[PDB]
């Protein structure tokens, strides 16, 4: 299928092709795409969780972001 880990099964979790933290496919409008690793993250799964999608051009996930 498109994803060899979950075989695209909508009823299966997948941290590769869906939210990298929870594996959920819901709310794609709230899944930020990391501008380094291209993994998806629900705004609400992040720590800290964000109440809305950031305005800035680029976004980096917890695995890729530089130390603050």
């Amino acid at each position: 299928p498109s994803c060899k880990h979950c075989k695209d099964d909508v009823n299966r979790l997948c941290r590769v092709c869906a939210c990298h933290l929870c594996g959920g496919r819901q709310d794609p409008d709230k899944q930020l795409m990391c501008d380094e690793c291209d993994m998806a993250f629900h705004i609400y799964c992040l720590d800290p969780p964000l109440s809305s999608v950031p305005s800035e051009d680029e976004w980096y996930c917890p695995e890729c972001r530089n130390d603050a």
Partner: peptide, 8 residues
């Protein structure tokens, strides 16, 4: 930021 899907 990019999202998996956008309103537009």
């Amino acid at each position: 930021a990019r999202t998996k899907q956008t309103a537009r």
